[PDB]
Paper text:
Protein complexes of the mitochondrial respiratory chain assemble into respiratory supercomplexes. Here we present the high-resolution electron cryo-microscopy structure of the Arabidopsis respiratory supercomplex consisting of complex I and a complex III dimer, with a total of 68 protein subunits and numerous bound cofactors. A complex I-ferredoxin, subunit B14.7 and P9, a newly defined subunit of plant complex I, mediate supercomplex formation. We propose that the main role of the plant supercomplex is to stabilize its components in the membrane.
Numbering used by the authors:
A (entry chain H): 2 to 325
B (entry chain b): 2 to 44
C (entry chain K): 1 to 100
D (entry chain N): 12 to 499
E (entry chain a): 3 to 60
F (entry chain A): 1 to 29, 55 to 119
G (entry chain f): 1 to 101
H (entry chain Z): 73 to 143
């Protein structure tokens, strides 16, 4: 157990670097779509821009408004940041490359998803601003609404696999990736992940121009940074789940010796990178829904479809006795 | 004349119609097909 | 001494619910939360006993009591909302008209 | 496989009919085309029909309800005692529903969900009666209780109805938690939740010196929960406030059906399990407290609904005296007392719902009713004398037992309490007869005549109340059958 | 070809993920002497506890 | 085995420490909306539905057709509830 | 799933078939069974119609009442037919048809 | 099929592992019985290694730990 | 020791649920009591229940409590009362319940005192049970939907009542 | 442990004792005839007498020290 | 009465449990090794 901290740090530090550079990559791909260049002055090809923004942020004076909820105001970004970090303990990157081989890892991921709402709720309430509070309530409602669809899709995958172990879920896709028969389920899962991470076209907190003040409007300096970093770490995680559940995790595209020459971590990384490109591509492509429209989509479109897909998959597998 | 009422109901509400169809196949297979397979296996 | 320690954990939660009833005569929301603390303690009792006896019946009932607790909380807070909406306040002096 | 479910045919039918009514109501109440029609009476008539078809299915399938008893054993237990208890519960629900149509039409209470919740609670009480395991017992009790919490707050803009619902939820959830803690102690001590297993574990020992304190306290807490359910003192103070504050048809329903179902549970749990003396002393002391407190508090009341609530508390005291003695005649008399109290309460609430069209609230509002409606004043006087136990009305039967057990189990303090509280009850019942017949008020309230449903129900129950002691053989035989079928 | 500038932060993220996997994989292997076994159940735990005796007491 | 949860705890502690270092280094240099109650209720109901699906999905290979149809009956009851909520406008936020 | 049809109280009449199949019980429907079925269904349609007049939905109310009556009457007829085949109800005709086929 | 292979492998080596464990437990129980006889010497009425079960059927010695197998 | 730490955390957090001036803080301390309970369940080896207490109690029930309490904007005056006068009645009630129930198992479940001898060597291992072990999840799922399916369905009826009653009591359609 | 379902997916530790006690009580018209089997079942449930005896041993060790 | 436990209504478990005695979840562990 003495080397466990080394493993945990070898997970957490590169994740914080990967998030720093996800912000950069988002600014670069959006720029290129818009015929612009993006950050390219601060470091060669702009590669030192993350470091500069982080150092700027830590050198900013904290504000700490005169609220009766001094402690909760500072604790809310810690809460969300911690929740975003702790989900990676059960994520397998390759065969045997995982910190905790939880037999209940699927339900554990669902539980972390469910805990994610409290940081936003508490930030909104503790800010002593009715705009922040209302924006927070709307964001929390949206998150819990789309968690229902996320959970029912998790149930579909679990029915196919018959085990909550994430490594087992990956290794059950050796015959075929689950995203081929369940391609509509993959589509609905990617959309539900956009709505759960509060990302475009569902990013209410970004719609300040729209008279919608986000839950983190009062935050400055590093609390504001912790909210932003938690949100982006959640996007890489949701891209990793899309990869694990439907694109066969670390497995190669084809069971051929030429494809088995490159290791599984490279396959996993490439699929994660494809999904992160799509998160940015969608932000760059479409306008955003109003709150009532996306709430209607959550309850009236994605709950029914997810439930119907659970019924159809379980019934088809029970009929022909293809169950795990 | 309940044949275009179904047509309108599909036109207005395609997600509901698709959910009913997908879940209905999921219910139909074990209800009907599965006893057919079990009987075909008995003989 | 394992069983006694788990049991006293659950028992302290139950007693805390009782005290929370006893200590909140102006605060009916905390009374509802004290009842939820008692229900949690009972669920813990069932799970601990299930383990101690090597018997599954305590786990089946724990799950069902979970469903019941959720339903009770939803209905309880609905009644709280309509009580507040009618009166404009949650103070106990406005919910004491029926008497004798 | 399909034939196994013949044992749950009545429940399957009533649940599916409830779903059909829920869908029908929500579809046509939202319809702009029909101008959002009030559907409370329509769904009420359809639900009354559903209850009568359920009753037909249950009563005409007496041997089939015991089919597949080993497959169904870990879920419930159907026998003759459950058969008759469920028939009586369905009859109570049908009568209560038939007493609600004028309330739906004239107050314009348009919510059809009222009928749906009544039917769902009827399902819950049906499952309560056949419960044969602590888990199933608790689940059915919770289903019934949640339906009652929601219907107690149905007049959602009324201060009284919201207050009633809030007190019901808090005191009901508290009592349910206490009862659940008792179930956990019993399970931990015996490793068993099934009533048969609990019977085998607990018989032959009772308090044999080395008594399991876990079992004893599980029993005590479960007993506290049951006593809350039957409104026995000192677990009663929720009842008068909820009875007053709830809409009057809710008060009528809560007065009858839950008592039938909870007493079925109490019989099958306690009379059948085996801790013994303490369990009966619990009910003895609570019966005495209930009789005394109910009599005094009713004597203090000036409003009709509160008087009826306190009268019901006193009468459950009288009934529980039968459970206290722990003999065959005790169980028989408990069942007879429940049946007669239910019919009398149905009579009384039919009259109350009839007078609620002119908003009766106080006992003084009944002044000069023998002039404005002489036959209604006679029918109501008959009910009050029956409540007071004056022979040869049906109410005497239950009073007769009280003293029969008091001189049978050898308890003269119980006899003295019964004599004094009977006199007090007689006083506050004949005060209503005095108000309707002897008083000459300056201002009279003229009451609208009742509808056909309530007049027919009133005529039948009044004929029963005056004439039951002429032909009481069927009830005596059937209750003796039920008391025997508890053990064999 | 300017669009390759965008492929650098993405490649750095992919390398960060490859580190998050492989670095923890090689540290566990050094500490235990063999790679981590996926699906360690009660049987494998009991086998390890028995193998300790069968090795050390030999 | 529960052995695999200990790394999660040490991970939590380390994440806490990182959080406090990042947050601390800078310190060195009246309108009730019922629609939120209603969305909470809906979420709670379907949360319990996902909860009851987890054991069913892992146990489908043993419970066979009986288990499938009992879960279908469960879903049917809860979906009738959902249709009631839909027709009553609890799913509309305009 | 292990099953056991055995009842607590034994059948008091010749047991023609212990666990008759669904279609066998439906095919055992007699004239009295159809009379019970039709009476329940007709009463239910009538109650649906009469209670639907005031809200203005007599037709839809008729369909709803008829569905409730159809389910209840079919269940009642099945109950009687299966009880006769199992020996729980007087089953003269069942035994007469059994002793011949 | 893969899981069935692993379960087959575990089933065949089961008897030797159980026999080893049985020998170990018997030797340890003998040692503990000598210890109990030593300590409980001079205490009248003691019976060394008495079976608390009236049926006399063998049960493993209770540990007093609720769930020791999972950790 | 670990059980002592968890018990102490739960005891303080529960006191803060029943004694906090602000009900929002009360709901937040309740989340801490549920987290501690999850830890206890992990110690007992019931990881499914440990996760479900997180998902349902914290993820769904506490959220509903928080939404309602936050939007109510309760003023501290409407719910404030001094609790020094309740120390005697709390003392008697709590002491009776303590002396009677913290020691209810002691006669029935007598604790095994830890001796200065290695009793771990007398743990008997039966390998037959370990060939194909069941998780908490599949052990529960083996029973919920077949042998005890009726109670499962009654719980569904309970949930249906909650949905109906929530709509009927609070809905005001725009 | 009277149901038979063990928490690890096998027969419960105390099921056989329960079944012995039940089978004895099914034909013995006196509960005292099955007292030994009943206390066997309850001993399996709580290990009261076993732990009491081991505590006696520990107490004697502490006394002789 | 004298020994209600003796009656056949009260011995449901003794006749139903043998019918499920081979069901996965309640078997003696050695049964899988020999069968
Ligand atoms: C507008 O969007 C942006 C942000 O602000 C919200 C960012 O968070 C950031 C900057 C933040 C980062 C992700 C930088 C990387 C994160 C870190 C490893 C820590 C952040 C701070 C530092 C670089 C300095 C570290 C100093 C200490 C606190 C002492 C510990 C040694 C970017 C890239 C950005 O453009």
């Amino acid at each position: 157990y003495i080397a466990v901290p080394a493993e945990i740090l070898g997970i957490i530090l590169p994740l914080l670097l990967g998030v720093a550079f996800l912000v950069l990559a988002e600014r670069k791909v959006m720029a290129f779509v818009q015929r612009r260049k993006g950050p390219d002055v601060v470091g060669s090809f702009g590669l030192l821009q993350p470091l500069a923004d982080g150092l700027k942020l830590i050198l900013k004076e904290p504000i700490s408004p005169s609220s009766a909820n001094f402690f909760l105001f500072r604790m809310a970004p810690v809460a969300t940041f911690m929740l975003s970090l702790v989900a990676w303990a059960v994520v397998p990157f390759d065969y045997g490359m995982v910190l905790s081989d939880l037999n209940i890892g699927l339900l554990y991921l669902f539980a972390i998803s469910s805990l994610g709402v409290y940081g936003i709720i508490i930030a909104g309430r503790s800010s002593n601003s009715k705009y922040a509070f209302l924006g927070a309530l709307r964001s929390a409602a949206q998150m819990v609404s789309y968690e229902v669809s996320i959970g029912l899709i998790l149930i579909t995958v679990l029915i196919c696999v018959g085990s909550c172990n994430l490594s087992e879920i990956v290794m059950a896709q050796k015959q075929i990736w689950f995203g081929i028969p369940l391609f509509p389920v993959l589509v609905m899962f990617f959309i539900s992940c956009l709505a759960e991470t509060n990302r475009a076209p569902f990013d209410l907190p970004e719609a300040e121009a729209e008279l919608v003040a986000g839950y983190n409007v009062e935050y400055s300096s590093m609390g504001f940074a912790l909210f932003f970093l938690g949100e982006y770490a959640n996007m890489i995680l949701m891209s990793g789940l899309c990869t694990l559940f439907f694109l066969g995790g670390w497995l190669p595209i084809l069971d051929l010796p030429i494809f088995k020459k490159i290791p599984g971590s490279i396959w996993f990384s490439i699929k994660v990178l494809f999904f992160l490109f799509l998160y940015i591509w969608v932000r760059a492509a479409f306008p955003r829904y109003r709150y009532d429209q996306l709430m209607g989509l959550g309850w009236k479109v994605f709950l029914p479809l997810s439930l119907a897909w659970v019924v159809s998959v379980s019934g088809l597998l029970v009929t022909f006795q293809w169950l795990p | 004349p309940v044949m275009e009422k179904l047509r309108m109901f599909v036109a207005q509400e395609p997600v509901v119609a698709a959910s009913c169809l997908i879940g209905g196949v999921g219910l139909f297979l074990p209800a009907v097909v599965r006893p057919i397979l079990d009987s075909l296996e008995a003989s | 001494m394992d069983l006694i320690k788990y049991f006293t954990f659950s028992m302290i939660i139950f007693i805390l619910g009782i005290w929370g009833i006893l200590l909140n005569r102006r605060n009916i929301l905390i009374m509802l939360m004290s009842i939820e603390l008692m229900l949690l303690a009972v669920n813990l009792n069932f799970l601990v006993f299930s383990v101690s006896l090597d018997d599954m019946m305590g786990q089946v009932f724990a799950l069902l009591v979970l469903t019941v607790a959720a339903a009770e909380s939803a209905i309880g807070l609905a009644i709280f909302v309509i009580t507040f909406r009618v009166r404009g306040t949650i103070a106990v002096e406005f919910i004491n008209s029926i008497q004798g | 496989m399909f034939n196994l479910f013949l044992a749950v045919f009545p429940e399957i039918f009533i649940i599916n009919a409830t779903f059909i009514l829920l869908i029908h109501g929500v579809v046509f109440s939202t319809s702009k085309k029909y101008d959002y029609p009030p559907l409370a009476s329509n769904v009420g008539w359809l639900g009354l029909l559903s209850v009568l078809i359920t009753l037909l299915l249950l009563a005409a399938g007496a041997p089939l309800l015991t089919i597949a008893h080993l497959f169904w054993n870990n879920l419930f237990r159907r026998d003759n005692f459950t058969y008759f208890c469920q028939i009586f519960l369905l009859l109570s629900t049908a009568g209560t529903i038939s007493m609600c149509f004028d309330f739906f039409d004239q107050e314009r209470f348009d919510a059809f969900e009222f009928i749906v919740l009544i039917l769902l609670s009827t399902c819950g009480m049906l499952f309560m009666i056949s419960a044969y395991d602590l888990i199933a017992m608790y689940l059915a009790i919770e289903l019934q209780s949640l339906c009652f919490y929601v219907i107690a707050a149905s007049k959602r803009k009324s201060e009284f109805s919201t207050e009633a619902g809030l007190k019901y939820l808090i005191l009901g959830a508290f009592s349910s938690g206490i009862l659940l803690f008792g179930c956990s102690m019993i399970y931990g001590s015996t490793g068993a939740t099934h009533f048969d297993q609990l019977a085998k574990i607990l018989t032959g020992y009772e308090i044999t010196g080395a008594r399991s304190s876990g079992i004893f306290m599980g029993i005590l807490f479960i007993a506290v929960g049951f006593l809350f359910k039957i409104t026995a003192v000192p677990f009663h103070m929720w009842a008068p406030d909820i009875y007053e504050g709830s809409p009057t048809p809710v008060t009528a329903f809560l007065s009858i059906a839950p008592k039938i179902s909870i007493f079925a549970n109490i019989l099958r749990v306690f009379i059948y399990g085996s801790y013994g003396a303490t369990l009966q002393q619990i009910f003895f002391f609570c019966s005495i407290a209930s009789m005394i407190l109910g009599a005094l508090a009713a004597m203090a009341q000036t409003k009709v609904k509160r008087l009826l609530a306190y009268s019901s508390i006193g009468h459950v005291g009288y009934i529980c005296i039968g459970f206290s003695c722990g003999t065959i005649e005790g169980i028989q008399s408990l069942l007879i007392g429940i049946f007669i109290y239910a019919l009398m309460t149905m009579d009384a609430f039919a009259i109350v719902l009839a007078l609620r069209q002119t908003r009766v609230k106080y006992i003084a509002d009944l002044g000069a009713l023998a002039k404005t409606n002489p036959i209604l004043a006679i029918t109501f006087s008959i009910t009050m004398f029956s409540y007071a136990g004056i022979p040869p009305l049906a109410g005497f039967c239950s009073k007769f037992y009280l003293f029969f057990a008091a001189l049978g189990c050898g308890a003269y303090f119980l006899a003295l309490v019964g004599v004094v509280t009977s006199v007090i009850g007689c006083f506050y019942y004949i005060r209503l007869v005095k108000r309707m017949f002897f008083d000459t008020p300056r201002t009279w309230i003229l009451y609208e005549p009742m509808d056909r449903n309530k007049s027919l129900l009133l005529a039948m129950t009044s004929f029963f109340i005056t004439l039951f002691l002429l032909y009481p053989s069927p009830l005596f035989s059937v209750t003796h059958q039920m008391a025997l079928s508890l053990y064999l | 070809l300017v669009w390759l500038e965008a492929m650098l932060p993405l490649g750095i993220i992919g390398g960060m993920l490859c580190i998050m996997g492989n670095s923890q994989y090689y540290i566990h292997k050094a500490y235990h002497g063999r790679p981590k076994h996926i699906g360690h159940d009660e049987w494998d735990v009991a086998m390890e506890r028995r193998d300790k005796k069968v090795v050390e007491k030999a | 085995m529960m052995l695999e949860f200990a790394p999660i705890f040490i991970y939590l502690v380390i994440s806490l420490l990182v959080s406090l270092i990042l947050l601390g280094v800078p310190f060195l240099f009246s309108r009730f909306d019922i629609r939120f109650y209603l969305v909470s209720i809906l979420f709670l109901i379907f949360d319990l539905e996902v909860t009851f699906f987890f054991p069913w999905a892992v146990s489908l290979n043993k419970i066979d057709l009986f288990g499938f149809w009992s879960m279908m009956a469960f879903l049917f009851i809860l979906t009738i509830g959902f249709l009631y909520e839909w027709k009553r406008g609890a799913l509309d936020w305009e | 799933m292990n099953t056991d049809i055995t009842a607590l109280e034994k059948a008091q009449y010749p047991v023609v078939d212990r666990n008759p199949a669904f279609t066998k019980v439906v095919g055992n429907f007699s004239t009295l069974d159809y009379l019970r079925f039709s009476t329940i269904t007709g009463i239910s349609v009538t109650v649906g119609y009469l209670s639907g007049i005031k809200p203005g939905i007599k037709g839809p109310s008729m369909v709803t009442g008829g569905l409730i009556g159809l389910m209840g009457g079919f269940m009642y007829a099945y109950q009687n037919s299966a009880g006769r085949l199992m020996g729980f109800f007087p089953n003269d005709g069942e035994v007469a048809s059994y002793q011949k086929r | 099929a893969l899981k069935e292979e692993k379960y087959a492998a575990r089933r065949t080596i089961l008897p030797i592992l159980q026999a080893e464990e049985d020998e170990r437990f018997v030797s340890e129980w003998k040692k503990y019985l000598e210890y109990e006889a030593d300590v409980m010497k001079d205490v009248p009425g003691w019976k060394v290694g008495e079976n608390v079960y009236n049926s006399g059927r063998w049960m493993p010695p209770a540990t007093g730990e609720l769930r020791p197998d999972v950790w | 020791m670990i059980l002592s730490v968890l018990s102490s955390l739960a005891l303080v957090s529960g006191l803060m649920v029943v004694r906090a001036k602000n009900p929002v803080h009360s709901v937040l301390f309740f989340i801490l009591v549920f987290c501690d309970t999850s830890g206890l369940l992990l110690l007992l080896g019931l990881d499914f229940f440990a996760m479900i207490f997180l998902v349902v109690y914290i993820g769904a029930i506490a959220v509903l409590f928080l939404f309602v309490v936050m939007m109510f904007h309760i003023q501290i005056a409407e719910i404030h009362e001094e609790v020094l006068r309740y120390l005697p009645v709390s003392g008697i009630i709590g002491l009776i319940f303590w002396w009677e129930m913290f020691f209810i198992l002691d006669n029935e479940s007598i604790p095994l005192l830890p001796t200065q001898r290695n009793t771990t060597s007398l743990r008997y291992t039966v390998y037959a049970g370990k060939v194909r072990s069941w998780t908490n999840l599949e052990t529960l799922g083996n029973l919920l939907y077949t042998y005890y399916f009726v109670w499962f369905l009654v719980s569904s009826l309970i949930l249906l009542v909650a949905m109906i009653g929530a709509i009927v009591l609070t809905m005001h359609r725009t | 442990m009277a149901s038979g379902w063990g928490i690890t997916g096998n027969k419960g530790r105390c099921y056989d004792f329960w079944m012995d006690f039940s089978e004895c009580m099914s034909h013995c018209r006196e509960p005292k005839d099955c007292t030994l089997l009943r206390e066997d079942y309850l001993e399996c449930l709580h290990h009261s007498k076993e732990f009491q005896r081991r505590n006696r041993i520990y107490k004697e060790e502490q006394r002789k020290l | 009465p004298y020994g209600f436990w003796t009656f056949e209504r009260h011995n449901a478990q003794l006749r139903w449990d043998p019918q499920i005695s081979q069901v996965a979840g309640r078997r003696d562990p050695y049964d899988d090794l020999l069968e």
